[PDB]
Structure 1
Amino acid sequence: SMHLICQSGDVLSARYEIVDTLGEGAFGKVVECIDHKAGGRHVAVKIVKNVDRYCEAARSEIQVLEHLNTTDPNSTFRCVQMLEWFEHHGHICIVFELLGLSTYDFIKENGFLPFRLDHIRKMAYQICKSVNFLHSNKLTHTDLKPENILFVQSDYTEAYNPKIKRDERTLINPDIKVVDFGSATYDDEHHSTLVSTRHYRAPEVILALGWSQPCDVWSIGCILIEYYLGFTVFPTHDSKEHLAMMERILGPLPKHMIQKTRKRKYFHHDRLDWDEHSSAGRYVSRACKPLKEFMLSQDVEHERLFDLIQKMLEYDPAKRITLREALKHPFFDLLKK
């Protein structure tokens, strides 16, 4: 159905001519359009599936972005700018400023290579600043992941690197914006039991212990390590295995969280019910290892980044570093005058 209305050359709302598809998600797709009203300026138009779940998210997003874009009209805090919304053949469509590739797609197109540390520093700072602005306004994003962090411009330079015997892309400008506010939840609204894309999901969410702003900090930690390594650190699609990967990289879960959860199926006698000597078990043991062993250098700047990641990946959300504190971490000192 969407297929029929999202084609190159189609005109939306008597104004936006589709150029082609930028990306696709469970919610629908985002297409690049020429805005014939605004002199031909290109914009991004998100076309939402005509399915209750995604319509409701889209309506919620529209409310959240009107609030954020009004509170911060210049995008000082780097939330994407929504321009307008309309309906096309029964689909909600939301128009945004046109950005570049997601950080995820950039990594993927570069053969799953990591970003350079100086870029990670800048991107991390901006992600923290942006999501902290949400947290200051009684909001939790709940779905932070590299697909939802987009470069303002994703242009790169490309040269043969003799060291790794392959061509390699170097990002020119690492500035980012945060997108997708369809799951963003206010402190005083209903909190769904399940949030976040699995790989970025906090342990309090997996264990259904209740969540708030700290779950975003966990997701960010997962994003940073992925920017450093070039790959997803919890790539599994199974909750128990995910928890087993956590234990191998970060150590055992806190006993008090284990005791409090209603997800008894993961546990036996307050320990993860996980056979380490099963095949899945041996894979987890050989693929995963303690966090600091992932470091590619012992240089102090790498140590600083890993200290920050370690603090973001604190199991107990009440002890996890806040984004206000993260912005003052030494890893960011090089950014300051």
Structure 2
Amino acid sequence: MEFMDYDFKVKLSSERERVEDLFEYEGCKVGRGTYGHVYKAKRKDGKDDKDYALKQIEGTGISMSACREIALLRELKHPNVISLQKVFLSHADRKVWLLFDYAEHDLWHIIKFHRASLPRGMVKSLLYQILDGIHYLHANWVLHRDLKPANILVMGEGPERGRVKIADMGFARLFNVTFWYRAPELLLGARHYTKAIDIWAIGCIFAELLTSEPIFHCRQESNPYHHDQLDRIFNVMGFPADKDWEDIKKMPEHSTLMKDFRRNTYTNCSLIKYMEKHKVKPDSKAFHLLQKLLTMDPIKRITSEQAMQDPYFLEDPLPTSDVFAGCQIPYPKREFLTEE
């Protein structure tokens, strides 16, 4: 069958911009994952000297992830959300490629760098821009649903130095593995994603930036109920009293929770004691903000707008648009992946 006009077809093929004609990226892979492959790339035509990131989406064709990430980034524009510069569709092999400005850094690498051994100004400034970006996303009816340090990019040297960029809309959703960042309502079977779910993830990231450890670290283990991840959360937070989370009774897995757990097991456990062992003062404005983000009952969790208004951000030092604050960036640049 020939469904397309021949003249139209040759014309399109003559004029099509091809990723491999525009960009040099062979042997320049810097990331590999379930998302697909990320490359650091330069324009072949030398018309500028900028670094670009190229994401070859996992799989072939227009999957649900490719579809979401294209559809949403096509619309979104905020200094704290990664900008979709261009989409290349490769017809021969049905690969989809996305083009972004290259972000040298990300929170995963930054936090690891510190743990292998975090300035408070930078911590605050990071948090402020994450909230800024998530608020924008929320105000535009988008839930991210996979916030984690690997998805929080930070721009290196250049005209956006120290700027946070939220990335990976692969799981994002209009609302109108590793479970360290997963809100407890999800672990208890809540069927809907909500804004409050993103906010919990941001509290997890904030704790990790304060201490250099993932607050709900847990080893790897289908259904939404994850026993050991819940156990780790109660060990840090305490087991919620009935008055802390009245709707806990309505969670599909509540009776499983009642079967597997006794609250008495966690009577000396609280966020205060945890953060104290890791040198964060229960007194601090930092701590009080953290406790509002990491509230077990999602309806009692603060919103991003209210979090941005928190007096923590009015306390010295003020958050800066460059999270590195004119200081020298000690973090290593991403390495090229040369493996098979």
Normalising by the residue count of structure 2, what TM-score does the alignment of the two structures yield? 0.75
Kindly provide the CA deviation profile for residues 234-270 of structure 1, in whole angstroms up to 9, marking residues without a partner as x: 121352122122222212135434421222574235x
Deviations 1:87-111 (A, max 9, x none): 3432211111111121111222344
The number of residues matched between the two structures is 284
Alignment match of 2:43 (pick from 6, 26, 35):
35
Q: 1:14, CA displacement in angstroms?
A: 1.4
Residue type of the alignment partner of 1:290: K
Report the Cα distance in structure 2 between the residues aligned to 1:325 and 1:178, rounded to whole angstroms.
20
Q: 2:130 aligns with which of 127, 130, 135?
A: 127
8 Å contact kept, 1:249–1:291? yes
CA distance in structure 2 between the aligned counterparts of 1:154 and 1:274, rounded to whole angstroms: 50
CA contact (8 A) 2:55 2:97 kept: yes
Deviation at 1:297, TM superposition (A): 4.7
Q: In the alignment, residue 135 of structure 1 is paired with which amino acid?
A: H
1:80-95 to 2 correspondence within 5 Å?
A: 80-88=82-90, 89-95=93-99
Assess if the C-alpha contact under 8 Å between 2:239 and 2:263 holds in 1. no
2:238 equivalent in structure 1: 251
Give the CA deviation at 1:299. 8.8
The residue aligned with 1:290 is 273
Which ranges of structure 1 fall in alignment gaps of 5 or more residues? 1-10, 156-172, 189-195
- Name the CA distance, whole Å, in 2 between partners of 1:36 and 1:29: 20
Q: SS of the counterpart of 2:171? A: coil
Q: What's the CA shift for 1:51? A: 5.6
The residue type paired with residue 98 of structure 2 is I
- Look up the match of 2:172: 184
Quick check: 1:214 aligned with 2:196?
yes
The equivalent position to 1:148 in structure 2, one of 145, 148, 151, is: 151
User: Which is richer in strand?
Assistant: 1
Q: Which digits, 9 at most, give the CA deviation of each residue in 1:277-330, with x for residues without a partner?
A: xxxx9xxx99x9834324415396xx1111111110111111100011000111
Name the counterpart of 2:100.
Answer: 96
Quick one: which of 73, 81, 85 aligns to 1:65?
73
Please, what is the CA RMSD of the aligned residues?
Answer: 3.0
Structure 2 partner of 1:193: none
Say which structure, 1 or 2, has more relative contact order (CA 8 Å, 6+ apart).
Answer: 2
1:270-309 to structure 2, matched below 5 A, reads: 272=261, 290-298=273-281, 303-309=284-290
- The more displaced of 28-37 and 233-242 is 233-242
C-alpha distance after superposition, 1:142-200 (max 9, x if no partner)? 11110001111179xxxxxxxxxxxxxxxxx6431111111111113xxxxxxx95110
Q: Among residues 64, 72, 82, which one is paired with 1:56 in the alignment?
A: 64
CA distance in 2, matches of 1:91, 1:219: 31
Is the CA contact 1:106–1:154 (under 8 Å) kept in the aligned structure 2? no
Give unpaired runs (5+ residues) of structure 2: 1-17, 321-340
Match for residue 313 of structure 2?
332
Cα distance between partner residues in 2 of 1:336 and 1:32: 29
Provide the residue aligned with 1:226 in structure 2.
208
Counterpart-to-counterpart distance in 1, 2:319 and 2:215: 30
1:124 touches 1:224 (CA, 8 Å); kept in 2?
yes
Q: Which one-letter code corresponds to 2:83 in the other structure?
A: Q
Indicate the SS of the match to 1:235: coil
Residue-by-residue CA offset, 1:40-89 (whole Å, 9 max, x unaligned):
4321000112168x8320221111001103xx4xx2xx101111111343
SS of aligned partner of 2:279: coil
Identity %: 24
Q: Counterpart of 1:203?
A: 184
Q: Normalised by the size of structure 1, how large is the TM-score?
A: 0.75
Q: Note if contact 2:210-2:280 (Cα within 8 Å) is conserved in structure 1.
A: no
Mark the CA change 1:328 to 1:146 in structure 2 (over 3 Å): closer, same or farther: same
**Secondary structure, aligned partner of 1:228:** helix
Q: CA deviation at 1:29?
A: 1.4
- Cα distance, 1:154–1:198 mapped onto 2, change above 3 Å: farther
- Displacement of 1:125 in angstroms is 0.5
Q: Relative to structure 1, is the Cα distance of residues 273 and 35 closer, same or farther in structure 2, using a 3 angstrom cutoff? A: farther
Structure 1 stretches of 4+ with a deviation exceeding 4 A read: 273-276
Of residues 113, 131, 135, the one that matches 1:109 is 113
Match of 2:29, SS state, is: strand
Instruction: State the structure with more CA Rg.
Output: 2
Helix, strand or coil: the match of 1:232?
coil
Secondary structure of 1:332's aligned partner: helix
